[PDB]
From a paper:
[name] adopts the canonical CDC fold with maximal dimensions of 123 Å by 20 Å by 49 Å. The most significant difference between [name] and the other CDCs is that it adopts a linear shape down its long axis whereas the other CDCs tend to be bent to various degrees due to different orientations of D4 with respect to the rest of the molecule. A significant difference, not observed in any of the published CDC structures, is the high mobility of regions of two strands (residues 29 to 35, 46 to 50) in D2. Consequently, the hydrogen bond interactions that D2 forms with both D3 and D4 that are typically observed in SLY and other CDCs are absent in [name]. Two gold cyanide compounds, used to improve the quality of the crystals, are bound to Cys 428. In one site the gold complex packs against Trp 435 and Trp 436 and the other packs against Tyr 461 from a symmetry related molecule. The Trp-rich loop in [name] D4 (residues 427 to 437) adopts the same conformation as that previously seen in SLY and SLO, despite the binding of the gold complex to Cys 428. The monomers in the crystal are tightly packed in an elongated linear arrangement. The buried surface between [name] subunits is extensive, with more than 1500 Å2 buried in the interface (750 Å2 from one monomer and 770 Å2 from the second). Thus it seems the linear oligomers observed in the ILY, LLO and [name] structures are glimpses of the very early stages of weaker monomer-monomer interactions required before the interactions become strong enough to drive the conformational changes needed to induce circularisation of the oligomer.
[name] ([name]), a major virulence factor of the bacterium, is a pore-forming toxin belonging to the family of cholesterol-dependent cytolysins (CDCs). [name] is produced as a water-soluble monomer and recognises mammalian cells via its C-terminal domain (domain 4) before assembling into circular prepores of ~30–50 monomers on the surface of cholesterol-rich membranes. The monomers in the prepore undergo critical structural changes, including the unfurling of two alpha helical bundles (α-HB1 and α-HB2) in domain 3 in each monomer that are then refolded into β-hairpins (transmembrane hairpins TMH1 and TMH2) for insertion into the membrane, which is facilitated by a structural collapse towards the membrane surface. The resultant [name] β-barrel pore has a diameter of ~300 Å that causes lysis of the target cell.
Author numbering: -2 to 470
The structure:
Amino acid sequence: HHGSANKAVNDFILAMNYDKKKLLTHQGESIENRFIKEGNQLPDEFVVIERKKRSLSTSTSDISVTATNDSRLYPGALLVVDETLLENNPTLLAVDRAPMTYSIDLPGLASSDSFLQVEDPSNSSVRGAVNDLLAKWHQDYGQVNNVPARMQYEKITAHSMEQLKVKFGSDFEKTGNSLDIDFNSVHSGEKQIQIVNFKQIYYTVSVDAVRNPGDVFQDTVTVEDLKQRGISAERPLVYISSVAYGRQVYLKLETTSKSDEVEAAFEALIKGVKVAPQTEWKQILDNTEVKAVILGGDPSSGARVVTGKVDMVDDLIQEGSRFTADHPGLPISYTTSFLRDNVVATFQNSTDYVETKVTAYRNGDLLLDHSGAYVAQYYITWDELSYDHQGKEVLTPKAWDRNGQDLTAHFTTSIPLKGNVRNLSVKIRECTGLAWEWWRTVYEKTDLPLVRKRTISIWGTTLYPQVEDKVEN
């Protein structure tokens, strides 16, 4: 502005030519898994894994923040555009700055003096400017009613730690690593997981468009000083054009189960006051469930890692639902704009993942009771399933120990089966003592269904056998 240095600085930037899209793309990896696999052992139920690769490509302009005391995330701030910016750890360009005018969008001022001037932008001045206003709004408002926080929720079922980054931000670890997350237990086919990111905005602070690239500096600054800090074209500049300020929860859910109507549990659980009347399946699921949850927000400092089950008990959802300027909020996300032209910077982050689907097949028992006045015989055959390599399959047949044996009395045994069991046949003859018909076949199903507890129960007399076929799922 007027002085020959600034002007030269202004030319510099304006003249910059570069690829806004080839600079804001970060990458992880791909390597192809052929599909294949399948096949798995068990404990108290038998699964088939099978891992079918998939592809995550996000692009936003809003950047999640999992900091609090991050001194370089203030609106106005210039960031360099280089590898560290993609990773959410940007090289800050402190350099003598000119003043700025920020807007602020909460209710109680609409236009009148919902504006602010700062002489030297910095985390401090800009905070202390804000925190001044948040008083005279508490002094007019906040205590007017519940000024309510604008919520915004997102989900992803897990699959890998990196693929999570591409959903929640190039900086997830210091949150990930904290929620205790076991994928060794989901490429096994054991656990299955989903992760929520609840956001609660109280207010937002933003910057009108910079009319000239020079305008952001002071006349003390030269191009030489910018070159000396590595700005190029190759490494241009953005400015933090907006910041939203509030509370955040990241939150991870894991269950024993594998019901292919599990997702449904959550979505309706999340909706809060949506108890279901016990008994249910979209309620058994939740009762075998264990959380871990991080709060960045409301009482400023660091994070609150916390766990509980749900039993709805963890409803911190509406914890910070009301604003009112008691304690301000911390910064949750921000936006950047190139200085050259005020174009919002838009980051395209991609990776493809190790995607592992799972499938049911519980395992019950078959129980026999013989309380008949006669002799009987069981022929009980089946096929035990597995997958070796390529998967394909492996049906090695099998057969009860007492096939053939004559059983009397009151005989009971419980033959237990597992999920891979298939082609289960069961035959039962009783013996009549009639010369022309030695045996009645009294029961004979092929491909019995596999159930928690089938119990076949034969009784009665030689000429008048009774049979109960009882399933119990």
